Design a protein around this ligand. Sequence first.
Ligand SMILES: Nc1nc2c(ncn2[C@@H]2O[C@H](COP(=O)(O)OP(=O)(O)OP(=O)(O)O)[C@@H](O)[C@H]2O)c(=O)[nH]1
Ligand SMILES: Nc1ncnc2c1ncn2[C@@H]1O[C@H](COP(=O)(O)OP(=O)(O)CP(=O)(O)O)[C@@H](O)[C@H]1O
Ligand SMILES: COc1cc(-c2nccc3[nH]c(-c4ccc5cc[nH]c5c4)nc23)cc(OC)c1OC
Ligand SMILES: Nc1nc2c(ncn2[C@@H]2O[C@H](COP(=O)(O)OP(=O)(O)O)[C@@H](O)[C@H]2O)c(=O)[nH]1
Ligand SMILES: [Ca+2]
Ligand SMILES: [Mg+2]
Ligand SMILES: [Mg+2]
Ligand SMILES: [Mg+2]
Lengths: 339, 427, 54, 439
Amino acid sequence: MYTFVVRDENSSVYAEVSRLLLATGQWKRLRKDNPRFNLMLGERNRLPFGRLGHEPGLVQLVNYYRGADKLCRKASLVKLIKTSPELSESCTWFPESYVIYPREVFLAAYNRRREGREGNVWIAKSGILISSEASELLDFIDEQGQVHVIQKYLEKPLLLEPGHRKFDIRSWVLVDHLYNIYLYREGVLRTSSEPYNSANFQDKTCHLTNHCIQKNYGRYEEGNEMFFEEFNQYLMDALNTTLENSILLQIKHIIRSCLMCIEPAISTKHLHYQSFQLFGFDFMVDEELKVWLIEVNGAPACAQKLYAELCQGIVDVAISSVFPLATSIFIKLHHHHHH
Amino acid sequence: REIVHIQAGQCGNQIGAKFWEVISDEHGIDPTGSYHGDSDLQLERINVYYNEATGNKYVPRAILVDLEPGTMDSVRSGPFGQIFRPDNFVFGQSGAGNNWAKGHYTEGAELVDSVLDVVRKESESCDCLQGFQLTHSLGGGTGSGMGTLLISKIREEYPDRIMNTFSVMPSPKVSDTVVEPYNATLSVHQLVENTDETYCIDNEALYDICFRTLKLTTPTYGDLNHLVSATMSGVTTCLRFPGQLNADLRKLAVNMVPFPRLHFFMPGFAPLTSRGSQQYRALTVPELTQQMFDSKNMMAACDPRHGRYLTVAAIFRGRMSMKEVDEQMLNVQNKNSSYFVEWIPNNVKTAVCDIPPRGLKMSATFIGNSTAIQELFKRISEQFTAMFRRKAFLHWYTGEGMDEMEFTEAESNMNDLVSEYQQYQDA
Amino acid sequence: MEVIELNKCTSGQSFEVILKPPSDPSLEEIQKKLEAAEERRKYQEAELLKHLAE
Amino acid sequence: MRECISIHVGQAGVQIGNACWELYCLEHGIQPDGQMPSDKTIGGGDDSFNTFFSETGAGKHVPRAVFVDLEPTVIDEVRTGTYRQLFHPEQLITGKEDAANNYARGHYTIGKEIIDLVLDRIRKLADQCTGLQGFLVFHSFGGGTGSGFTSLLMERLSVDYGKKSKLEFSIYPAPQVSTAVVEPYNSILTTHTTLEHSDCAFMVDNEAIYDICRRNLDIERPTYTNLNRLISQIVSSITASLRFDGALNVDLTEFQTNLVPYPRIHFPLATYAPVISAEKAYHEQLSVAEITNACFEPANQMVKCDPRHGKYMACCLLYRGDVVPKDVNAAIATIKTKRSIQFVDWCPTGFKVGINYQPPTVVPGGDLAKVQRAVCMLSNTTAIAEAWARLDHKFDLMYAKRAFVHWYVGEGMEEGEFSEAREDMAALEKDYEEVGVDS
Ligand SMILES: Nc1nc2c(ncn2[C@@H]2O[C@H](COP(=O)(O)OP(=O)(O)OP(=O)(O)O)[C@@H](O)[C@H]2O)c(=O)[nH]1
Ligand SMILES: Nc1ncnc2c1ncn2[C@@H]1O[C@H](COP(=O)(O)OP(=O)(O)CP(=O)(O)O)[C@@H](O)[C@H]1O
Ligand SMILES: COc1cc(-c2nccc3[nH]c(-c4ccc5cc[nH]c5c4)nc23)cc(OC)c1OC
Ligand SMILES: Nc1nc2c(ncn2[C@@H]2O[C@H](COP(=O)(O)OP(=O)(O)O)[C@@H](O)[C@H]2O)c(=O)[nH]1
Ligand SMILES: [Ca+2]
Ligand SMILES: [Mg+2]
Ligand SMILES: [Mg+2]
Ligand SMILES: [Mg+2]
């Protein structure tokens, strides 16, 4: 009989994990401030990591990796990628980005771009702004009042037909207490329902692919959610390639690169408590079938049809591996090249 | 750190004499008072309960009190009656007639100063007196009425010493008189104000254990007192034997009593054994741990699952693995965490004593400060109100000078104590 | 990796290696606090004796 | 040569003092009767070991130490133990009834009855000093004496010895070995009153020592003897620079200079390696690189916490045994590339290293094996504040319902002191986050 507490009532994924654990007949939910738990489904902010691992007689596990936030925040990600030699400023799969607070390095980037006779249109961070002249860009940063990064807006995205539409790929990644990196079988493609209009960036619906900002909506697929089998079938018919060869190979390389970089900082291998965490990686693919990393979310929400399967995978892979009870949906990412 | 023991009334002297019988055997003292044990570990803390007499003999620091002479003569007639000091026998000739007013206000008042002179005599010969323990019942007149008057007067002379009681609660299943709810309610009001720790020994629970568990169809008082004796020996094990803990009465009270009025403990013992019945199979540490927490092993007729544990003290006796004890004790708290208040972290303390009690290789004693003890006080209050609403049997008490308003106040204070337990059960 | 201030003796050595550069109450008050707590004790004790007197 | 006086308060401070002074005698060659055959200057001297030992005309070396307990059972074992003749009877001070795990009883009720005597005995040791530098105070957080009396003593020492440094060795409460449910109360109360009066405090979490004894010494249920002998090794590592020849941490003032850049953040984290069992048959002696890398494993720390999620303000490496600077620097270079070591921006990223060539000494019959090299790291990291968060949270749970508070008010303490102490701890936590956490 294992015990757990719930401290993020707004988590749809771990609400489903709570139901799955109780339905096993071998897990019991305690009051939220009961310290005698085996598992903590913790809050999103100021989680008391310092209080874990000090209960004699209890192996304790938590659904969050302390320090993983420096991957899951816009400004911190650019800092991590540019300063970590494992990734470097020469990193090929991250768009050119610059941290600016309300830089002479970013100003010298557009100064070489637009005055160099090339494309130049970027994006904001944290409502966003897509502009070609930096004057509008920086002016909005000071009006907003938060740290922002200026990132190259992929002017040449891969456009799904029929529709000339834009789109982003969401990958769910589970990292267990042993720091196994598990890529969930099922991704999802959040889609834009409007024709990508390079002429007018004020049209927010054909440039931003957030499921919320798409609120026109649902013409081509339900909920603007295209999944891997159909998208694989599309690239086969349209582009004579597969999802695995043209996209997923890069995605698996980016996921492993990011998490292997921060592993020494966040691993709980020899810690008095243990950590797992579910991540949400968001990718962009251009028309050259090159995959770009846009951001990664530390508390993602699943797709409706995939909730039952992914949350069941979290239990088997992350929770029952530590707390055992009385073909796999994940792809374990590992690579050992000798050089 | 010496303790002064006092037994008052029939029940107090009967369980008191049998307590001295049990621990004298544990420490190797014969009825004459000579030491004939095999280990010097029995004498390391012998001074807590015994004085050293001429001839290197050990005399209990015990005072025997009653308003009736007969029961104290039976004590002197008892197997270990000659061990006690003759000047510590303080008795009247009236008898209290199961009347709290007679014990507290009239007959007992005549004798109480004589008892305090023996208490003073015994305390003056103490290097560092820690406090007093009283054995008595609450249903009669002497141990109830005169015992609580004795407690009040002792607190007046020794206000910084610990006051400890083993108080036997009345039950209709083992009932001598209809006025026992009156005597108990008036006594509980006193104990709430003037004791630091009270072990609630419920005659209802003692009977139920003898009948349902020990398979005794007709339990004598001797059967009931066999459970009381084993329990009293258990809860005093730390005081009487050297161990890793150097515990005393005040440190126990500080750790067990989060609020001054909530100092009534549920005692528990495992394994439950019948008198004379031999135990061939020793319990394991998991068995001891689950029995000592079982409701069937509680000496107070309360359901622990109906309340929450504020604090718990557990005492293991015998040769066993401290690792296994720690694991089993942690297992009980971790698997039953809902029944321990979360606002008192780490509220369970465990001690292990290498010397087991007589006739057992392994044993465990439970001491719980649980809010479920309100069930015991609710039951006494209900039996009190059933008669007080018609002022039934009150003339026995108004003939000794008491007024009905004193009954109302005692009833009110105990209902207040019940509501105070309820407040922390929901907190 | 600059090794600074290397001092050596027959008992051992000590040094500094730098990787990167940067970027009361008086006696009377105590006696007053202790005496104020004893006064609260003797008041609380006097209330008990007054209560016992009643 | 500047003398140091050791003060041991309560059971924990006394018993740890016993094991420390036993280790000191073995390290310096002083026998239980106090003689030191290697000391050729009979009756006096200004050697490094004279910082902790005075000398009689009979050549007997006497610890500059006072033992205080409000109850006599513990110190009586010192009066009758192996080192009975080592201490003058005036160095051992006992009452008759203790503080009963009550800070208020140790600080106010009982402490006021004995302090003037304790200060008088301390003055006797101070008067035999030609240049006293300060005090080393050993005590527990959880005990009534270790918390209540120590804070009272620290206040008076500031008055009587205004310019003297005061260092603490503090035992942080752990349920695995604790004696009282109110130890979170006593810990916050004593830290609040002592904070301004301590220049440097080395916290030892009994939980960390307990687990190290279980994991690395293969002891199923560690006793106080197992814990205190391991604590003494760490304490000896920290004080060795005061008792032996060297250039680093030669006086108590240097501990504050090297480890404590800000006054209130004066709790350095100690990490020790290697801890190897005597019962281990085949052993592979660990190199300079392996013991230095072990300093950054939380399992070897005196307080369980994660320095990767805090910031460093100072780092000292105290080696004993076969260690040369070349290997230290090579080990540091390798470690810096693989470990998460971030200093604050107003501190240089550097390690202060001290090396004593004599390997650590072990008590005959002890649990620790002899090793050719050992190291104790003293780092001032904000990660130690995790221990404050754990303690303050347990404080909050009990105090919200005023559980056990009547025991303290009954001894003359006021309820306002609880909130005063807790509100100071809240400020201390804010200081640690401020310094160590980036936005
Ligand atoms: N590491 C270690 N901790 C100890 C030792 N003795 C006691 N403690 C710890 O110290 C804390 C408080 O207990 P004590 O120091 O014994 O109590 P005290 O200072 O004597 O104060 P009072 O007895 O209440 O007057 C507890 O957490 C104990 O676990 C010891 O020998 N070694
Ligand atoms: N360099 C870039 N180039 C082109 N489009 C970009 C872009 N960066 C962001 N976008 C667009 O913004 C949309 C949302 O991305 P972003 O990560 O900034 O918002 P978000 O934080 O709400 C994602 P989630 O919360 O689901 O993890 C993407 O779908 C993409 O179309
Ligand atoms: C275990 O049983 C006894 C112990 C003691 C005892 N002695 C000294 C310090 C003691 N702290 C404690 C103690 C008690 C409860 C809790 C809960 C959390 N932490 C605690 C510590 N109990 C102490 C005394 C006894 O009799 C007088 C005993 O028998 C009845
Ligand atoms: N357990 C137990 N209870 C007793 C014993 N003798 C009396 N009682 C109980 O005590 C109450 C009567 O009190 P008693 O001691 O006889 O009155 P007193 O002598 O005037 O104080 C009744 O509730 C009895 O059930 C005994 O030997 N053992
Ligand atoms: Ca000399
Ligand atoms: Mg986001
Ligand atoms: Mg009778
Ligand atoms: Mg003590």
